[PDB]
Amino acid sequence: NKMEAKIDELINNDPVWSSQNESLISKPYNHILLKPGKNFRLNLIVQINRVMNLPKDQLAIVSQIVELLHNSSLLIDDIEDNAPLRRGQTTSHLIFGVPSTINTANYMYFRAMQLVSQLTTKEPLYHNLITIFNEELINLHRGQGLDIYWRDFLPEIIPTQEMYLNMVMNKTGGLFRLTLRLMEALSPSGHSLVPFINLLGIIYQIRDDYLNLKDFQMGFAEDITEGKLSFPIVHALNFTKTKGQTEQHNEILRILLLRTSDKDIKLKLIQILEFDTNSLAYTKNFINQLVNMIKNDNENKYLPELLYIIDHLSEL
Amino acid sequence: NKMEAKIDELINNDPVWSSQNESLISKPYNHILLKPGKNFRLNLIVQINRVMNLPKDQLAIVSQIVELLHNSSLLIDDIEDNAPLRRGQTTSHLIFGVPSTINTANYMYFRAMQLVSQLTTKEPLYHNLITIFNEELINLHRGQGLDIYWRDFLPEIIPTQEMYLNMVMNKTGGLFRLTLRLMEALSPSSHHGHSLVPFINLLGIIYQIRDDYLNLKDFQMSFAEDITEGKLSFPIVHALNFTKTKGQTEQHNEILRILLLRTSDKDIKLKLIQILEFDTNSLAYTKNFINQLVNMIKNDNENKYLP
């Protein structure tokens, strides 16, 4: 009966959770926190707020939600991408293991969700805040799904430029739109800045893909080891199909499929994209055109310190 | 000019997502759907609705939300537990890879969350369903994190029977309580009696202890993957704390060594089992523990837990 009394007191109570248990399972998350770039995701929110005007207490919460979602996404992305480093540091799953990292990352998504309720007391608004959160996280998982599928089942599907851009609108545009849509919904205060935040996500991503190869040609071109269907690689694959460069098209697939860390093999692929397909110049120029679409936006049809961010978008 | 036009169209529209795309991402999930148990998790929902009386359309969505969370939880748990099999079938991550499986599973978490807003249009009630959904998924992750922590840090921390039971209230109680708390908040029924959460908690507990018990018993009588996983099973927690108390130092260490082996070796697995069989009598202890738990419900004449 002391057993039953114990079982009885157990089931008539909320589940026990100590602050100690909380520390033990937050290890993978505390590790990625030791990484920079933070002050920048914070500079973008701060700038957009000059327009949205939410009180600083609400802006702090919007910011905590996004940081939890962002860092958790990277903890996961690194398992998904077999990444050994993130922001010059050893990846969490390599230290604590994939099991703990996945669980903790998923855990933080729900803490993030929890915080949405500290943004309002109003039910109509709260319901909309949750829908935005739910929607963009659904979008993030969709693009991430395609990026991962194209790569892992290559050459089953060779994405075209169009397909890549759609994948990026979901994948990368997910959190960008999330942050902005929350702010536009909490604003006490012109046209929606969503097309502009979308163009930013796109630029951010093609730039991430591009710089990952160009800095090795001049990091470690880890994208090649991953086998990622990046902007430069998507152009090269399609370009070779179109110009009938069979041998080169196949060599590109062969190298991607090696998941190689050999610097010379990676450098060969890059030099193929440089001189054979001209995928690097194409990408650098595609980036510039997108940036000009904003820099030449006088009539403010995209646009509402703003541009300073566009050139330091790599540090977010 | 034409490139700028295309980008303009793109950024002014919602992200494009086709049904073929939906089919691609769904592959790891669909693969697990070829699995039984469904006419039983759904059986419990049915039964309890006899007291809750939710209108079918609403009950089905609950059934849907529960199914997505459960199947998704299993996809991830198998990755976390390095499980090669689930219901006799090759686990999803061994077929589609860990990357796609993790992504798909999480996606389904959010799809499940989406179904929550289609349970009701009343803004007060909806908020409660979300808080419910949110709270239990958090407990689920807390328990899972602890079950994984003990295992992966062994032998840093060896839980006591009590710590184990608390871990289970979180991990396994989560989905059980989420299912019932939703149904109770939706119930059109005036006063369907005392809340059934205490009863669903005891159920969750019996369920997990029995799961750990059966993993070893169906191997002592004839794969015992919990040993290969190195899991702090209910019988294992009992054996470890039983040898520590009876000062049986060498048996205590032998148990730890085998769990730390992460072994698939039949002989060695048989060896750990014979220790629990003859040395600590942990399997008989577990069987009896389960029976006591059940008797709490069987001899519930004043219906304190039962409806």
Ligand SMILES: C=C(C)CCOP(=O)(O)OP(=O)(O)O
């Ligand atoms: C969930 C998101 C948006 C992260 C995607 O990152 P990528 O795998 O595309 O590249 P890195 O962020 O690791 O540079």
Ligand SMILES: C=C(C)CCOP(=O)(O)OP(=O)(O)O
């Ligand atoms: C959460 C635990 C311990 C078991 C999960 O699987 P079930 O016992 O519910 O069985 P199936 O859903 O896989 O049929």
Ligand SMILES: C=C(C)CCOP(=O)(O)OP(=O)(O)O
């Ligand atoms: C997320 C939950 C609740 C499933 C936990 O199942 P276990 O980790 O106990 O392992 P299985 O025996 O169910 O495979």
Ligand SMILES: [Mg+2]
């Ligand atoms: Mg990555």
Ligand SMILES: [Mg+2]
């Ligand atoms: Mg990635």
Ligand SMILES: [Mg+2]
């Ligand atoms: Mg398991």
Ligand SMILES: [Mg+2]
């Ligand atoms: Mg498990």
